[PDB]
Design a protein around this ligand. Structure first.
Ligand SMILES: [Zn+2]
Ligand SMILES: [Zn+2]
Ligand SMILES: [Zn+2]
Ligand SMILES: [Zn+2]
Lengths: 205, 9, 205, 203, 203, 8, 8, 9
């Protein structure tokens, strides 16, 4: 990507945001990988929207890129697993355990086993490591603390957490300059000239 | 139609 | 929305498309509601990505906006229901029937009942209306035919199916004019001047 | 002749009950088909033990022997279905609806459709015909009353509801007569009976 | 004295079998606990009728009576668990693992963990200890062999595996002696025996 | 109506 | 070892 | 850095 193209993406991010196209902002953030929106991430975590959270993360890192991003995905999936136990949906919990958590076993066989054993518990607070789990909201809040630490330390996010400072509506400003450039090439008056479209260059005649 | 701020005068 | 803002969205749609930000294109299409991408819609239907399909439709119409859009959502949900029966997942099929299809009962109690009765069949081809269902792919293909008809006749899509014709990279062209405008305000040579950024106006000094 | 065997079963039934072999009594009642224990049937229905209730019935009649038996099996499987809806196990209710209730479709196509459509309801008490039935205990009781009438009217159950009037432990009494008849041949007595397995002798 | 009652049960067992009242025979064997029918136990295990296999055992021993009985229940519940994995019903296997197998955790904490971890495997034959067991028919057979040894060694089963040697229809024979002893008092005969329910008379 | 063996 | 009533 | 086509001469 050109640096031109890269900066143009950032202008577009500012535009979409101001025009309040919220879902389009975060899709572009993800796809471009240029900027990671913490505020968004926290919000999705509190809401427990794990599919969206992982999808948003997928724009920035894979699960085994480094030990930070790894512990990030593990924390998220582990909570998803715990919540399934706390609604007593042991059918979903096993599904989670095999399809989402097994990738971590390769790297640590014993932790995967100790977490597997949580299925056979009447309540996972019987485990002294997990005795600290209160309500869902608090668990998500506690885990978000850890997540923000992992992310800010992750070298693949570290320089992506702060949006480029610019004057508001920079793209609109540039567009206006384009209209000025086009009109300045006309050979007729007058100010208050009519601009029919952005699609084709404006003329006066 | 479109908004247009002139930038000379 | 200004007509300026509206046209700027279209330029951005062209940009994202050319830069191949595929998911961002369709999120913006949906959120803005300005353009409905048939090609995309067909592709998602063949893939049977019902959640995305309905989400994409939600940018353009609600389920009860008119009888076209209604028959659109019904067709989609009915197929989702049939596929769940054809994988013998009668647990999901009932879930679908109550949570997705019941809204149609208000408008037609009898059709909802006749479709409910499909649960107790060994195979839904025993119903002569549904005897025509072959494989999944063919069913989706047949139903897509109907869908394209419903959409093109739907007054809320009818004028949204054809993208505004423009020269390629119109936005990039406009940006270039902005650079020309900025530089033309400088008081020094020379062509091949250095442009440091789109973020703040360029100067020569 | 064969009524020897039939009667001997009743003596064994009485013996088993006096020995508190409860499960063995009712299996025998069922396998022999000689006696229908209404008191036990009432119990199990109140307990909602539907599989056992049906298995016990099966020693007496099939679902399609006559209109009485069919209405008995229907009501049992209907209530079994509703109870699944009442605990919001719509998966079990579907299982019931196909595996148990589908047989009644042939005989009444529309009633099967109507009962199927109770799945789609947020609560089946939205149906006017079924707006009546709660809680489970009462419905069972109301059902039991109807089941009792259906059974007492069912031809295959007419002369199977009253247990023969017997002195207590008739079989034990007969076993004693057998020992007397063995001892009376002893050459001579002597009361140190060693077994029932082989005839006793004195020497 | 009480061995009258115990022996009379064996006569009834023999009578029930001769009358082909199969279900009633085994309920009685179980409720009385007097005789363990290995031939029947073998059958049901081959059929994988685990609930009935366990219910039949329960008339003889509890899971924690001795180390033999516990290993018997363990192997039964292990195989029941594996079979669920083999049909990819990991939901049922979890149910089994908590409701049936958890009792054995107390006595061996690590073995319960190890068997739990078989859930996470794409196929449990990835475990070296269990890389051996297929198909189901063979495993059952291999298990049955071990179960037989465990039973024949279990103290609570020692003198319950051999049915007493009896002439055919001993009970019917005794019932006849009773009728003879009734008829010998008639004042006088005459063979038109009307019932077993009350003593016969001639007049 | 019952089987009866007279011995003897 | 068995209960036996002698009548009479 | 950025690409720049001049549009006079
Ligand atoms: Zn002009
Ligand atoms: Zn310049
Ligand atoms: Zn004697
Ligand atoms: Zn006589």
């Amino acid at each position: 990507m050109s640096s031109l193209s890269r900066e143009l993406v950032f202008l577009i991010l500012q535009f979409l945001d101001e025009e309040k196209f919220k879902e389009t902002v975060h899709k572009l953030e993800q796809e471009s990988g240029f900027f990671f929106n913490m505020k968004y991430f926290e919000e999705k975590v509190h809401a427990g929207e794990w599919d969206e959270v992982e999808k948003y993360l997928s724009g920035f890192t894979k699960v085994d890129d480094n030990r930070y991003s790894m512990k990030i995905f593990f924390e998220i999936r582990k909570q998803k697993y715990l919540e399934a136990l706390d609604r007593h949906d042991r059918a979903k919990a096993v599904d989670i355990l095999v399809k989402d958590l097994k990738v971590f076993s390769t790297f640590n066989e014993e932790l995967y086993k100790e977490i597997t054993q949580l299925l056979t518990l009447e309540n996972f607070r019987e485990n002294e490591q997990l005795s600290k789990y209160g309500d869902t909201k608090s668990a998500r809040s506690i885990m978000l603390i850890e997540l923000k630490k992992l992310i800010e330390a992750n070298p693949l996010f570290r320089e992506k957490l702060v949006f480029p400072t610019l004057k508001a509506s920079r793209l609109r400003t540039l567009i206006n300059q384009s209209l000025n450039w086009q009109h300045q090439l006309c050979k007729n008056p007058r100010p208050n000239p009519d601009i029919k479209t952005l699609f084709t260059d404006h003329t006066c005649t | 139609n479109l908004i247009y701020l002139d930038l000379n005068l």
